[PDB]
Design a protein around this nucleic acid. Structure first.
Ligand SMILES: [Mg+2]
Ligand SMILES: [Zn+2]
Lengths: 81, 233, 23, 717, 62, 687, 225
RNA sequence: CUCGA
């Protein structure tokens, strides 16, 4: 019911605020998952028990903050407040 | 001059008779040069056919209301103006539309002489009141662009004939905007975006290809003057 | 003329009042 | 988005660029990768684009008055050495483009980028947190451009003509695309009234009801409209399902739409809709013919006649000073009212003589920029100018700037102009000082609980009843009633409750109580919120910027403090009056108050003033002593005389203002109670900002007063 | 006393601070800014700060 | 900056300093205009910063008596009779009389036309008074303004607010490569340039014997020769290019006191603070949105707003504890490619273009062995390079600088050059950049109409006139009627008439609007120069009449209408603009606020030794200050991690900042912020 | 109301200015065609200009030559007025030697085979008795406007002084249309293109280059997907 | 000290 979100607007900030209690809570959900995705890319070549990889399909050279923000939108993550 | 490479044309199809075209990448700042020109060529230089004037039986000096139908006179003209039609004959042709009795009139209830084609038979035209009758005569001509009814004042016979705006052009609405793309670390290279909404007479692809032919012919007049070098790839 | 004292270019002034004392 | 120079980004993202230069094997090691960035090898410009991809940056312009003084953007690599800023965030930054500079800050950690992407992004902060009204809206050229196409012009070409004679109706187009083709050839004008069959715009809820009503209008259904082609192009920018508006787009009209868009439609729609207004406004502002020429500065036709009538009246007051019938101190006051009355007659002579096509009028009357007082000074007369003393000069500047001031006229004008700039540096100093005082006193006020559950609240004057019988809307609804939440069900004369307790007072929910006859509501307030340290969310209400209930953890105190100190740049009462209230000082007015309700005993003389009050119940007479230099406030009396000047025998209530001025807030507490003194300070501070054109919600003023009454003193240990 | 010494009258607050031997519980916006702690507001409160995120049991095969 | 800025600086009157007053004790009464300042101190020219009112400029005709008070001249009126006798009156001497305003209607004999005339009286009173009461009258209308203020044409149509900025920004003009005198002048431009002292005036009359780009020789009538040497490409105090150029040719008879050569911001002896630009007053697609400016790329292609700038770079070779700093081409661990632009001494060679980071002077300083990092001593062993006890301390080009090396000056203790004790060699390298006008460079006019360049469109994109000539600059309309500076609109009108020329209808007499104009104004040739003196000059009645008789172009067509507007064509689409637009010529100046200097960025860099926070200022390669007010904005957002991040790892965390830089180049995550070293110092100071 | 193919006929005013009438164009079509030619004329017409120069006694712009009245900066600005055409399409060197009293003009330059100077009367410098001017001029061929190529980007050594190159030979382009708005069956626009060059090429040659540029470009819409 | 918003 809106124009296609372009650039950093996507995923729409309105739908992301639905899977979360407040603006401040969405920040920690995305950032803590972004650190997991970033540690998977740096521990994929070495070490076992590496963190769970990107749940959605990532784009080429996509920032881990953007990967984490898309999968929060896709209801693939949980939380604990 | 020098070589300027990689300009390509891509098409995104919104609907069957409306597509978006992107010409990329035009070197800065051509996007505006061939931008407004491509639009005006589409809107004003594609041959099409449309109703030139109509004549309604029972309507002579009033033009306020037609008895036996809910629609008044001007509402008939609107749905008739939006009637999409094509002709293979250059000369003007007259088409008659008649239907009686309670019911509904359509553009399929029209009888088309040979050579003319009605592309939207399901288009509503008028609702017939009980024991209602409607006779109307339509005049179809070939032309390009949009010509007002006032110029068709002489075309109408002095017997209840009314002229109408003629939407000859097959394309309905064209808009364009120019953005920026970086070919080689230069952010000024222009990218042209064309949005063409057309009738079902032709698709946006052929409407654009028609505009390209008529423009190459147009600038061919200048090209014929000397045949010198120019930035080309 | 304006400032016809050093030999400068002739700038034409919209002056209705005479200048009694030079700068 | 924002455009920052390529050379800036390379140094800003230098360690990130070095990382990728060794990944893509443009550089052998990280050591040589650093030398590549310092030498600007051609590989870095291709790599730099990959690096800044969806990595937000922070833009800031000093002074940082409110929180929107820093906003996050998505960087886009542009050539040149200047920062490219979006034209809609200029209101938030108070940023013009006459040499301003901004700072860029790069968040590194994942949490810092997430705070920039969600909390600080410019698209997520369209509304002002101080008032709730939008800021990123068409402001200058944009509002003029939109005001152009949404104007109905009678004699404009291509207009509608009723069917007369042999020709039928002229100027009725089957499609807006046809009206475009008509205006393209040159038959129709974009500002001409026509009839168009629309198929992709929801009709007004008024006429959608009579055409459909049973079911909402559907994309594809047709209907007729009596607009202009431009008004149709304007409504196309607004989203589908928004009721068509056939009005002329003043700035007030556009602000009302965007405020309604922010309340109902989601955030991403509001952000994208205003970009369409921006692009469209600029397009038509370019083609609106708005130009300033010496010919367009029209002079009043009766300019000579008007001044001679007042030069005569000034010559008679000058002759009435020659015979000594007027005091010298009175002659100046007498001549001032002659020229104050003269400058009004010249200003009125301009409004009627100026057409509405003239661009100088079109700019001002569209909400674009400027006052008519500027236009009157520009074409009519400057008027009375102030000398560095303060009072107006007994002689006015009769010339206009179009005519050309004389040597003496120009010289006397500079006196007020220089002292105007001079105190603007001092008035900002006391403003910024009052702001930082408000910050430290409320820095630790946070929303820590969802609901403190106290049914306590306060009564808000929603509207005023009338002798005529129709309720009159109270002026204080915007700042004191909207965005509140209820603590008591609103009950009309019927048993039905209109709005439940704990419901955020939206725009229609105020008309629900308005159309119900009830003129008073009890709302939850941050004052009555009983929480140990912070305040509960239910008592705060709607976050003006978010348009929803305040989140738990938002530092509402700092937001409230900045909200009050940002407009403090513009005052005269005045700014010291605001400091007298927030510092709980014994004011200059020092107005008396009625300590006990009862009967008034006015014992006025001329040497002095003494007034007693017989207590209406028990007690003994309470004697005061006041100077005759004050005057009694017109008190609403019990027998229906609202303008009843206080004479003996009136029935005043407890804690009622006696004489005019400012009642001592220290004494207001020790009379009516802590609940009432907080209400006094709120709408007393609000009257200083309201009397200047600044709308701050009472919520923010209340957050400060809550910190002033959190302490009590000890009488007995 | 740390939030006050950075506002006004630095010596007047620091003198009365050492006399009464006041101890400051570092729980406040102005205080945590100085020492470098997360401010107890917004994303700094314990409600949003200590949060665990884990993927749902549905997982990819590759 | 320019000759006007220098001339104004010498005529400044400053309240601050010893014996005067403190800036903290100057109230709002010392700073504002006093009625005794008439004809003595300017009421317009004063800075708008914290020094407003405290610094003024002396009025034009004013002078100082040996006592210390400022005198201003007046024409003594005996008995309603204007006399050519002129006497200077002090401030209190002026109050004991009454003086008539300069623009008094006066008989050819001297008698006032009206019995009652506008007259100034003691205590700043203005009123009519009998003609037999006028004791004196003003010399010139412009008697009350400063020299810079008197250079603003149609000043009487601009409010004092923007008039102040107009004079203050004229002193900020940058000397361009070539200079053009303005079409619309005030007459003051000539004397302002001559009296400033940056031109070359002939001392004695004679003929030009020899003229070169280096010097001009004048053969006097008596027989003696005086030779004037030209100052060529010299760096000014503020980095502007002071360059003089000869005007006369071989064998030209030159009178005494005549300009034979002019320097920066001078054209034929007149103040040329800018260029004449074809301006259109219209909004244009938002690129000129509130005070932004759109420029035609012609100003770039033709060096119209191009200016030369010169920077001075310096380094010295001292005596250290372990030896002596030596300037040498041999620099440890540097290729022969970076040192390729250096001569055998280690100095960059004249003419070499040098970007930022290039070596200008190769200096090495001996560093002790006990000063070596553990890794550096290992890194020295794993490369086998012995005898490198010296480190690199070469003079490099700062960030944001680039240009041609134009001059080198070397000072050596060995060669009798007196250096400070402890120095053995001193080198100064002069670098000159040729700065075209860029996006963001600050332009301005003479009426306080300032703005940065928002967009430099190609010449074809610019809205062009009927004969294809595109405009040069597009000024937004919205920023005109707010500021009350119609002078720019009136200059634009008179500017066009000057560009085209005019011919008034002489048949059937002189028309009723041109009766007051001098006969020299009835006919004008294209590109004519005119003077609009302050408080005198062109009236709107005559300006309206000139637009009606503007000369046609070469094709015979009149482009601008009697209103002053013309029909423009949108160069981006081709459709003509729907309404006529005011078009003319306006004098625009390039102010010394260019993005080439005002852009700065920093990843990491130096830190202040004591506080361990980043340095300040661009010159020290420092970072921006996230101030106290800015931290309130973070907290208002609830951006806790951004706030902690700014004040720790990005600032004064000694270990966090290094570990963050490693975490970025490693691709790891950002580590946890530590404790600020600045807070550690606070505790050690409370102790 | 049916098609008649448009025709273009040249009108000459002087040796470097010509008017072109194109008719019959559709209504409203005339303004857009004139612009699309004007934009291509003012920008993308191939021409030759001087890339860099080299004066013997100097090493950079900011200096003087003994005996000449103009500094090297002012000499280079006068050299920006030079109009020149080159057949080689590759870098080629012009020479200029003059000495003694006199004025150096553009005609004093000796161009190599293929390159020719089109205004031999342009003032360059004034020389007195002691003045000698020896200048090399590298002339390349491109289009539009290219700024001076850096010495760090080029292989040019210290003596070479790069200059901005203005390649376009077109001087001033405009157009006008005459709309036939008589209410009748026949309406048409007549475009009048006005082109002025700088004697490097004739006006019809420039319009031919802009024609072949646009014919090539608009051919991108004719190809199907 | 001098200036820029
Ligand atoms: Mg500003
Ligand atoms: Zn509460």
């Amino acid at each position: 019911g809106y124009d296609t979100p372009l650039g950093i607007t996507n995923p729409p900030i309105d739908e992301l605020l639905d899977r979360v209690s407040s603006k401040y809570a969405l920040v920690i959900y995305a950032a803590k998952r972004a650190r997991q995705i970033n540690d998977y890319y740096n521990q994929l070549g070495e070490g076992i028990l590496e963190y769970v990889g990107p749940l959605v399909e990532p784009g080429l050279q996509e920032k881990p903050l953007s990967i984490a923000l898309r999968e929060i939108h896709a209801d693939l993550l949980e939380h604990t407040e | 001059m020098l070589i300027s490479q990689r300009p390509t044309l891509s098409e995104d199809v919104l609907t069957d008779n409306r597509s978006q075209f992107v010409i990329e990448p035009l070197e800065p700042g051509f996007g505006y040069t061939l931008g407004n020109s491509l639009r005006r060529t589409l809107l004003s230089s594609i041959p099409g056919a449309a109703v030139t004037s109509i004549r309604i039986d029972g309507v002579l000096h009033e033009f306020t209301t037609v008895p036996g139908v809910k629609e008044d006179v001007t509402e008939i003209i609107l749905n008739l103006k939006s009637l999409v039609v094509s002709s293979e004959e250059d000369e003007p042709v007259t088409m008659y539309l008649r239907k009686q009795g309670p019911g509904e009139v359509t553009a399929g209830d029209i009888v088309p002489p040979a050579g003319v084609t009605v592309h939207n038979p399901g288009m509503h035209i008028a609702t017939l009141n009980d024991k209602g009758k409607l006779e109307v005569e339509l005049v179809v001509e070939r032309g390009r662009g949009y010509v007002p009814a006032v110029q068709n004042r002489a075309s109408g016979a002095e017997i209840g004939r009314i002229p109408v705006d003629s939407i000859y052009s097959p394309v309905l609405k064209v808009t364009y905007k120019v953005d920026a793309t970086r070919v080689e670390q230069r952010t000024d290279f222009d990218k042209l975006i064309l949005d063409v909404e057309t009738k079902n007479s032709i698709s946006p692809r052929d409407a654009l290809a028609s505009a390209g032919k008529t423009l190459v012919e147009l600038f061919g007049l200048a090209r014929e003057l000397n045949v010198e070098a120019e930035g080309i790839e | 003329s304006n400032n016809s004292v050093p030999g400068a270019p002739n700038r034409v002034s919209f002056a209705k009042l005479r200048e009694p004392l030079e700068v | 988005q924002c455009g920052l120079p390529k050379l800036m980004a390379l140094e800003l993202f230098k360690p990130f660029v070095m990382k990728r230069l060794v990944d893509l094997n443009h550089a052998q090691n990280i050591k040589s990768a650093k030398r590549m960035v310092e030498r600007q090898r051609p590989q870095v410009w291709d790599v730099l684009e990959e690096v800044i991809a969806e990595h937000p940056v922070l833009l800031n312009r000093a002074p940082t008055l409110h929180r929107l003084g820093i906003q996050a953007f998505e960087p886009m690599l542009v050539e040149g050495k200047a920062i490219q800023l979006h034209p809609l965030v200029c209101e938030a930054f108070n940023a013009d483009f006459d040499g301003d500079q901004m700072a860029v800050h790069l968040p590194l950690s994942a949490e810092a980028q997430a705070e920039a992407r969600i909390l600080m992004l410019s698209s997520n902060n369209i509304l002002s947190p101080a008032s709730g009204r939008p800021l990123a809206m068409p402001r200058l050229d944009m509002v003029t451009g939109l005001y152009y196409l949404t104007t109905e012009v009678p004699g404009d070409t291509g207009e509608y003509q009723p069917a007369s004679g042999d020709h039928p109706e002229t100027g009725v187009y089957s499609s807006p695309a046809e009206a475009i083709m008509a205006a393209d050839r040159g038959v129709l004008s974009v500002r001409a009234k026509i009839k168009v069959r629309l198929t992709q715009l929801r009709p007004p809820v008024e006429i959608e009801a009579e055409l459909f009503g049973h079911s909402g209008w559907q994309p594809g259904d047709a209907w007729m409209a009596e607009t202009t082609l431009g008004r149709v192009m304007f409504n196309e920018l607004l989203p589908l399902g928004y009721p068509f508006v056939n009005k002329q787009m003043h700035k007030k009209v556009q602000a009302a739409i965007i405020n309604d868009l922010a309340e109902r439609y989601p955030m991403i729609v509001v952000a994208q809709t205003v970009d369409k207004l921006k692009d469209a406004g600029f397009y038509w502002a370019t083609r609106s013919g708005v130009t300033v020429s010496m010919a367009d500065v029209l002079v009043p036709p009766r300019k000579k006649e008007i001044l001679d009538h007042y030069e005569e009246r000034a010559d008679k007051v000058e002759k009435q000073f020659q015979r000594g019938a007027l005091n010298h101190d009175e002659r100046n006051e007498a001549l001032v009212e002659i020229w104050k009355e003269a400058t009004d007659e010249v200003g009125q002579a301009l409004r009627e003589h100026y057409p509405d096509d003239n661009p100088i009028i079109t700019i001002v009357d569209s909400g674009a920029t400027g006052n008519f007082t500027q236009t009157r000074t520009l074409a009519g007369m400057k008027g009375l100018v102030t000398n560095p003393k303060g009072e107006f000069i007994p002689r006015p500047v009769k010339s206009s700037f179009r005519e050309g001031l004389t040597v003496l006229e120009y010289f006397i004008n500079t006196h007020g102009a220089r002292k105007g700039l001079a105190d603007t540096a001092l008035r900002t100093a006391d403003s910024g000082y009052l702001t930082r005082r408000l910050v430290d006193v409320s820095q630790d006020v946070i929303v820590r609980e969802h609901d403190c559950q106290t049914e306590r609240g306060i009564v808000v004057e929603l509207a005023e009843r009338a002798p005529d019988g129709t309720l009159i809307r109270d002026p204080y609804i915007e700042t004191s009633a909207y965005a509140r939440t209820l603590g008591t069900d609103a009950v009309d004369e019927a048993g039905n409750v209109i709005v439940e307790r704990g419901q955020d007072l939206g725009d229609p929910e105020i008309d629900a109580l308005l159309a119900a006859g009830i003129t008073q509501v009890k709302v939850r307030s941050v004052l009555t919120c009983a929480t140990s340290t912070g305040v509960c969310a239910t008592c705060y209400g709607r976050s003006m910027a978010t348009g929803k209930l305040v989140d738990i953890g938002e530092a509402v105190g700092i937001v409230a403090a900045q909200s009050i100190g940002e407009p403090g740049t513009q005052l005269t009462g005045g700014l010291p009056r605001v400091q007298e209230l927030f510092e709980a000082r014994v004011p200059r007015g020092k107005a008396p108050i009625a300590d006990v309700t009862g009967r008034v005993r006015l014992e006025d003389g001329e040497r002095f003033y003494k007034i007693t009050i017989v207590p209406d119940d028990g007690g003994e007479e309470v004697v005061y002593d006041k100077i005759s230099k004050r005057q009694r406030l017109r008190v609403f009396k019990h027998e229906d005389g609202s303008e009843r000047v206080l004479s003996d025998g009136d029935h005043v209530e407890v804690g009622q203002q006696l004489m005019e001025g400012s009642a001592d807030p220290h004494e207001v507490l020790r009379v009516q109670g802590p609940r009432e003194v907080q209400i006094h300070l709120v709408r007393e501070v609000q009257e200083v900002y309201r009397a200047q054109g600044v709308s701050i919600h009472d919520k923010h003023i209340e957050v400060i007063v809550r910190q002033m009454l959190r302490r009590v003193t000890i009488i007995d240990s | 006393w740390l939030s006050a010494a950075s506002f006004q009258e630095t010596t007047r607050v620091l003198t009365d601070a050492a006399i009464n031997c006041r101890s400051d519980k570092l729980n406040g916006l102005k205080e945590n800014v100085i020492i470098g702690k997360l401010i107890p507001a917004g994303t700094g409160i314990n409600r949003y700060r200590n949060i665990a995120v884990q993927p749902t049991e549905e997982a990819r095969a590759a | 900056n320019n000759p006007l800025s220098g001339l104004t600086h010498k005529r400044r009157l400053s309240a601050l300093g010893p014996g005067g007053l403190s800036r903290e004790r100057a109230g709002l009464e010392v700073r504002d205009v006093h009625p005794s300042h008439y004809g003595r101190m300017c009421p317009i020219e004063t800075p708008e910063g914290p020094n407003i009112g405290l610094i003024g400029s002396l009025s034009v005709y004013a002078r100082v008596n040996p006592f210390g008070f400022i005198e201003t001249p007046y024409r003594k009126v005996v008995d309603g009779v204007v006399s050519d006798e002129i006497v200077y009156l002090t401030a209190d001497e002026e109050d004991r009389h009454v003086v008539a305003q300069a623009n008094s209607p006066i008989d050819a004999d001297g008698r006032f036309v009206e019995p009652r005339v506008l007259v100034r009286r003691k205590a700043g009173e203005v009123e009519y008074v009998p003609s037999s009461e006028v004791d004196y009258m003003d010399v010139s209308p412009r008697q009350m303004v400063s020299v810079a203020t008197a250079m603003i044409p149609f000043l009487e149509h601009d409010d004092a607010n923007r008039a102040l900025m107009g004079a203050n920004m004229q002193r900020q003009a940058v000397p361009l490569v070539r200079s053009e005198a303005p079409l619309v002048g005030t007459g003051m431009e000539l004397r302002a340039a001559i009296d400033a002292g940056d031109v070359v005036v002939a001392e004695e009359s004679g003929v030009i014997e020899e003229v070169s780009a280096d010097y001009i020789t004048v053969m006097h009538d008596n027989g003696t020769r005086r030779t004037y040497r030209m100052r060529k490409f010299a760096r000014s105090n503020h980095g502007t290019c002071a360059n003089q150029c000869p005007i006369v040719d071989a064998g030209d008879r030159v009178e005494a006191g005549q300009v034979i050569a002019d320097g920066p911001c001078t054209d034929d002896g007149e103040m040329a603070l800018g260029k004449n630009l074809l301006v259109a007053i219209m909004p244009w697609e938002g690129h000129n949105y509130e005070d932004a400016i759109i420029l035609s790329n012609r100003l770039v292609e033709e060096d119209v707003l191009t200016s030369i700038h010169i920077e001075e770079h310096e380094i010295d070779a001292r005596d250290t504890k372990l030896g002596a700093e030596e300037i040498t081409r041999d620099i440890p661990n540097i290729s022969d490619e970076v040192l390729a632009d250096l001569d055998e001494r280690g100095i960059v060679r004249i003419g070499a273009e040098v970007r930022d980071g290039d070596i200008l002077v190769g200096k090495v300083t001996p560093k002790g062995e006990t000063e070596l990092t553990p890794e550096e001593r290992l890194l020295r062993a794993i490369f086998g390079e012995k005898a490198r006890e010296v480190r690199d301390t070469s003079l490099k080009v700062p960030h944001g600088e680039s240009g041609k090396v134009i001059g080198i000056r070397v000072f050596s203790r060995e060669d009798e050059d007196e250096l400070p004790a402890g120095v053995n060699e001193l080198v100064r390298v002069y670098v000159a950049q040729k700065r075209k006008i860029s996006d963001g460079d600050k332009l301005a006019g003479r009426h306080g109409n300032k703005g940065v360049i928002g967009k430099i469109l190609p010449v074809e994109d610019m809205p062009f006139l009927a004969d294809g000539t595109p405009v040069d600059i597009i000024l937004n309309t919205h920023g005109v009627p707010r500021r009350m500076n119609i002078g720019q609109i009136l200059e634009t009108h008179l500017g066009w008439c000057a560009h085209s020329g005019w011919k008034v209808d002489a048949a059937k007499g002189v028309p009723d609007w041109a009766a007051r104009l001098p006969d020299e104004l009835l006919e004008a040739q294209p590109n004519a120069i005119v003077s609009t003196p302050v408080f005198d000059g062109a009236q709107e009645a005559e300006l309206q009449g000139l637009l009606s008789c503007t000369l046609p172009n070469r094709d015979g067509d009149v482009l601008v209408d009697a209103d002053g507007k013309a029909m423009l064509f949108d160069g981006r689409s081709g459709e003509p603009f729907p309404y006529p637009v005011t078009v003319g010529y306006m004098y625009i100046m390039k102010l010394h606020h260019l993005v080439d200097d005002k852009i700065h960025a920093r990843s990491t860099g130096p830190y202040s030794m004591i506080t361990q926070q980043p340095l300040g200022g661009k010159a020290q390669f420092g970072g921006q200050r996230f101030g106290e007010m800015e931290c309130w904005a973070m907290q208002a957002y609830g951006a806790a991690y951004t706030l902690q991040e700014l004040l720790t790892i990005k600032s004064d965390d000694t270990v966090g900042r290094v570990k963050v830089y490693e975490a970025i180049v490693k691709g790891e995550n950002i580590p946890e912020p530590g404790i600020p070293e600045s807070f550690k110092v606070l505790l050690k100071e409370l102790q």
